[PDB]
Design an enzyme around this catalytic site. Structure first.
Site, PDB file in Angstrom:
ATOM      1  N   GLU A  72       0.849  -8.426   0.677  1.00 34.70           N
ATOM      2  CA  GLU A  72       1.056  -7.042   1.193  1.00 34.70           C
ATOM      3  C   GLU A  72       2.534  -6.716   1.379  1.00 34.70           C
ATOM      4  O   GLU A  72       2.812  -5.668   2.010  1.00 34.70           O
ATOM      5  CB  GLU A  72       0.216  -6.816   2.459  1.00 34.70           C
ATOM      6  CG  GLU A  72       0.004  -5.340   2.786  1.00 34.70           C
ATOM      7  CD  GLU A  72      -0.632  -4.493   1.689  1.00 34.70           C
ATOM      8  OE1 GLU A  72      -1.297  -5.069   0.772  1.00 34.70           O
ATOM      9  OE2 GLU A  72      -0.434  -3.257   1.729  1.00 34.70           O
ATOM     10  N   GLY A 117       1.114   5.653  10.939  1.00 34.48           N
ATOM     11  CA  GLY A 117       2.533   5.957  11.183  1.00 34.48           C
ATOM     12  C   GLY A 117       3.367   4.717  11.507  1.00 34.48           C
ATOM     13  O   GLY A 117       4.582   4.832  11.394  1.00 34.48           O
ATOM     14  N   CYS A 176       3.036   1.630   9.963  1.00 31.85           N
ATOM     15  CA  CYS A 176       3.158   0.668   8.823  1.00 31.85           C
ATOM     16  C   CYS A 176       4.611   0.623   8.349  1.00 31.85           C
ATOM     17  O   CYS A 176       5.268   1.695   8.251  1.00 31.85           O
ATOM     18  CB  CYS A 176       2.180   0.964   7.694  1.00 31.85           C
ATOM     19  SG  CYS A 176       0.473   0.607   8.204  1.00 31.85           S
ATOM     20  N   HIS A 207       0.832  -1.233   0.000  1.00 33.91           N
ATOM     21  CA  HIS A 207       0.000   0.000   0.000  1.00 33.91           C
ATOM     22  C   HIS A 207       0.864   1.280   0.000  1.00 33.91           C
ATOM     23  O   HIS A 207       0.297   2.366  -0.172  1.00 33.91           O
ATOM     24  CB  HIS A 207      -1.019  -0.039   1.117  1.00 33.91           C
ATOM     25  CG  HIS A 207      -0.495   0.129   2.503  1.00 33.91           C
ATOM     26  ND1 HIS A 207      -0.437  -0.934   3.375  1.00 33.91           N
ATOM     27  CD2 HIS A 207      -0.162   1.232   3.212  1.00 33.91           C
ATOM     28  CE1 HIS A 207      -0.023  -0.497   4.560  1.00 33.91           C
ATOM     29  NE2 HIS A 207       0.176   0.821   4.467  1.00 33.91           N
TER      30      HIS A 207
END
Length: 182
Positions: free
Chosen positions: A72, A146, A148, A41
């Site tokens: 991911e 904040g 990730c 992402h």
């Protein structure tokens, strides 16, 4: 404060950079040579900022399992003039549950941040922001925007990178040794 925080600090001090994309600042784990990881992402493009230095992306691969399901994790090769310490021998070979994990973050907003998250479950499937996702680890800590890309470790193992939360639980994508064979 103790041997878990010691291992986490040793990884943060040598194997992390601050990555900036158009979708924000992320903790980014360097694994070996000029190869690092970031949550998918983050939307890595042809150019990324590494510790506020404009850096060409030589390759970026958004990983999926052999069910063609999102993991991911994006693996990035950076056009950087310096190699990371090789930490592939700290990566697990198999999917697993863990005790007594630490989540460590280093950004402009959250420098030198360490969180004892406790027990880590092999959760498996998660609908992450609407996207079916496999190989998710879960911990019972109220993680926030904040964090990730934050690194999840136990003593002697680098097991995942933080990719989301539901306000009560946090979720990491597994790192496996097989992702980084060369």
């Amino acid at each position: 404060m103790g041997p878990g925080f010691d291992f986490a600090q040793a990884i943060m001090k040598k194997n992390t950079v601050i990555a900036r994309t158009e979708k924000g600042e992320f903790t980014m784990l360097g694994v070996y040579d000029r190869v690092a990881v970031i949550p998918t992402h983050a939307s890595v493009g042809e150019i990324i900022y590494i510790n506020d230095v404009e850096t060409r992306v030589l390759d970026a691969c958004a990983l999926r399992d052999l069910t063609d399901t999102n993991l991911e994790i994006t693996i990035v090769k950076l056009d950087r003039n310096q190699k990371f310490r090789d930490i592939r021998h700290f990566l697990p070979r198999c999917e697993d549950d863990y005790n007594d994990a630490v989540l460590s973050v280093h950004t402009s907003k959250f420098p030198n941040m360490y969180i004892p998250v406790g027990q880590v479950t092999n959760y498996g499937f998660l609908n992450l922001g609407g996207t079916p996702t496999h190989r998710i680890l879960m911990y019972n800590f109220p993680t926030r925007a904040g964090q990730c890309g934050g690194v999840v470790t136990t003593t002697g193992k680098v097991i995942g990178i933080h990719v989301g939360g539901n306000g009560a639980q946090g979720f990491a994508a597994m790192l496996l040794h097989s992702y980084f064979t060369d």
